Design an enzyme around this catalytic site. Structure first.
Site, PDB file in Angstrom:
ATOM      1  N   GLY A 263       3.959  13.911  72.526  1.00 57.67           N
ATOM      2  CA  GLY A 263       2.647  13.335  72.293  1.00 57.67           C
ATOM      3  C   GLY A 263       1.568  14.215  72.912  1.00 57.67           C
ATOM      4  O   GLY A 263       1.913  15.297  73.400  1.00 57.67           O
TER       5      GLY A 263
ATOM      6  N   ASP B  95      20.743  36.484  76.001  1.00 59.26           N
ATOM      7  CA  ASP B  95      19.791  36.478  77.122  1.00 59.26           C
ATOM      8  C   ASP B  95      19.193  37.887  77.248  1.00 59.26           C
ATOM      9  O   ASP B  95      17.997  38.063  77.384  1.00 59.26           O
ATOM     10  CB  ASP B  95      20.387  36.064  78.459  1.00 59.26           C
ATOM     11  CG  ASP B  95      20.967  34.659  78.433  1.00 59.26           C
ATOM     12  OD1 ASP B  95      20.619  33.859  77.519  1.00 59.26           O
ATOM     13  OD2 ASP B  95      21.795  34.367  79.341  1.00 59.26           O
TER      14      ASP B  95
ATOM     15  N   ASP C 221       4.525  16.075  77.754  1.00 60.52           N
ATOM     16  CA  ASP C 221       5.518  15.039  77.378  1.00 60.52           C
ATOM     17  C   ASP C 221       6.920  15.410  77.864  1.00 60.52           C
ATOM     18  O   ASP C 221       7.138  16.570  78.250  1.00 60.52           O
ATOM     19  CB  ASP C 221       5.448  14.799  75.881  1.00 60.52           C
ATOM     20  CG  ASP C 221       5.649  16.030  75.040  1.00 60.52           C
ATOM     21  OD1 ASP C 221       6.764  16.574  75.125  1.00 60.52           O
ATOM     22  OD2 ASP C 221       4.711  16.402  74.306  1.00 60.52           O
TER      23      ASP C 221
ATOM     24  N   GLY D  43      -0.903  16.231  75.249  1.00 58.29           N
ATOM     25  CA  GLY D  43      -0.673  16.664  76.622  1.00 58.29           C
ATOM     26  C   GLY D  43       0.766  16.833  77.021  1.00 58.29           C
ATOM     27  O   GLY D  43       1.626  17.082  76.162  1.00 58.29           O
TER      28      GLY D  43
ATOM     29  N   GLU E  61      25.986  33.795  74.889  1.00 55.57           N
ATOM     30  CA  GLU E  61      24.932  33.508  75.883  1.00 55.57           C
ATOM     31  C   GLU E  61      24.487  34.795  76.556  1.00 55.57           C
ATOM     32  O   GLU E  61      23.291  35.048  76.667  1.00 55.57           O
ATOM     33  CB  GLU E  61      25.436  32.538  76.943  1.00 55.57           C
ATOM     34  CG  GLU E  61      24.453  32.206  78.058  1.00 55.57           C
ATOM     35  CD  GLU E  61      23.324  31.328  77.534  1.00 55.57           C
ATOM     36  OE1 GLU E  61      23.597  30.118  77.296  1.00 55.57           O
ATOM     37  OE2 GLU E  61      22.199  31.849  77.369  1.00 55.57           O
TER      38      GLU E  61
ATOM     39  N   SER F 175      18.693  27.969  75.795  1.00 53.87           N
ATOM     40  CA  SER F 175      19.209  29.204  76.368  1.00 53.87           C
ATOM     41  C   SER F 175      18.385  30.418  75.991  1.00 53.87           C
ATOM     42  O   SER F 175      18.329  31.410  76.738  1.00 53.87           O
ATOM     43  CB  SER F 175      20.640  29.548  75.905  1.00 53.87           C
ATOM     44  OG  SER F 175      21.606  28.681  76.510  1.00 53.87           O
TER      45      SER F 175
HETATM   46 CA   LIG Z   1       2.658  17.396  74.086  1.00 52.33          CA
END
Ligand SMILES: [Ca+2]
Length: 356
Positions: free
Chosen positions: A334, A82, A338, A336, A78, A278
């Site tokens: 979907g 990063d 979601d 826009g 991690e 991450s």
């Molecule tokens: Ca979408």
């Protein structure tokens, strides 16, 4: 056929990160609750990548320090992920890495220390650690949320991975769960996609979901935080949990996270390919630092603005779901916004332009 791995530079090119900006003049804070980095891994990484190694500084919080454990499956995967993802894309930025005990106290303190750091003064905070909302005490949740609130008034953007265990977030209790701190309304929650990039552009981008055995992006509806007014036009649905309750929709943005289309990195001195949400908070942290460099003023708290920008600033993910607990496809992507991918992957040059 489709590539099985990317460099950060490849991912950034697909998301049209704004060019000729390297984060010079900015500081990105990265919070860490275990493991560490070694100079050998990073120098090899940045040399092989072909970018000038950025300045990285370790900061001790509550007595913890930079200590690699040597297991690439552990926390070093991690810490080094990063730094390598964000440093590859904002290599002119200074990186401040705050190491704290993996406790409510250490997590909070590392954050408040960063936000207020008078010497390194980060304008961005990247977090890739977390836990399901109800796994937190209400008081820990409150301290943390107030730190995020503080961050907003100080002009510091806070980004956080939404989780790698789908819509149930690693809890089997008949209920769907979002992760904190991604659920905080003051945090830019970062979800996960599988990216397929071709010729520098996106050929396909779908929800990250490799099943119960290979992980899925977190995403869903907060049970702790109400729906913020800046989400009122995003068509957030109610939680899929029995009382159908209204809540903060997670995440806000999403980007490549699927290990199967993963990042090429160097962990504990050896090459490998990993992913996870991450990787996405570092990814976008770099993006924000570039924007800060160009605007000459920290964007600070960005969430409200994102949701009122023109929709074509984002690459809409419309296919896939982040269900790994069952086959009911909760939740699903979907048109826009979601609860798997938020507004989508940012299109860096358009985002910047809309903020000029
Ligand atoms: Ca979408």
């Amino acid at each position: 056929a489709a590539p099985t791995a990317y460099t950060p530079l490849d991912v950034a090119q697909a998301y049209q990160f704004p060019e000729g900006l390297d984060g010079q003049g900015q500081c990105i804070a990265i919070i860490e609750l275990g493991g560490g980095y070694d100079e050998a891994s990073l120098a090899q990484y940045f040399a092989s990548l072909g970018v000038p190694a950025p300045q990285v500084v370790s900061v001790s919080v509550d007595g913890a320090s930079n200590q690699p454990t040597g297991d690439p499956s552990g926390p070093d995967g991690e810490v080094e992920l990063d730094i390598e993802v964000a440093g590859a894309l904002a290599p002119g930025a200074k990186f401040a890495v705050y190491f704290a005990p993996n406790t409510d106290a250490g997590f909070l303190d590392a954050i408040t220390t960063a936000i207020h750091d008078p010497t390194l003064k980060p304008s961005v905070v990247s977090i890739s650690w977390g836990g399901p909302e109800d796994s937190w005490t209400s008081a820990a949740i409150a301290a943390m949320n107030r730190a995020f609130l503080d961050a907003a008034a100080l002009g510091v953007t806070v980004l956080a991975a939404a989780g790698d265990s789908g819509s149930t977030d690693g809890e089997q209790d008949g209920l769907y769960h979002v992760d904190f701190p991604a659920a905080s309304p003051y945090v830019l929650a970062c979800g996960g996609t599988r990216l397929v990039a071709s010729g520098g552009r996106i050929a396909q981008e779908t929800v990250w979901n490799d099943g119960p055995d290979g992980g899925a992006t977190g995403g869903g509806v907060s049970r702790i935080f109400p729906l913020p007014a800046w989400q009122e036009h995003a068509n957030v649905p109610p939680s899929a949990n029995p009382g159908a309750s209204s809540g903060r929709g997670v995440p806000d943005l999403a980007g490549n996270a699927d290990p199967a289309t993963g990042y090429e990195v160097v962990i504990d001195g050896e090459a490998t390919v990993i992913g996870g949400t991450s990787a996405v908070a570092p990814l976008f942290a770099a993006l924000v630092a570039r924007i800060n460099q160009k605007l000459g003023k920290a964007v600070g708290y960005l969430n409200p603005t994102l949701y009122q920008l023109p929709a074509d600033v984002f690459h809409d993910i419309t296919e896939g779901n982040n269900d790994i607990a069952n086959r009911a496809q909760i939740y699903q992507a979907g048109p826009g916004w979601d609860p798997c991918t938020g507004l989508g992957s940012p299109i860096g040059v358009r985002l910047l332009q809309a903020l000029l």
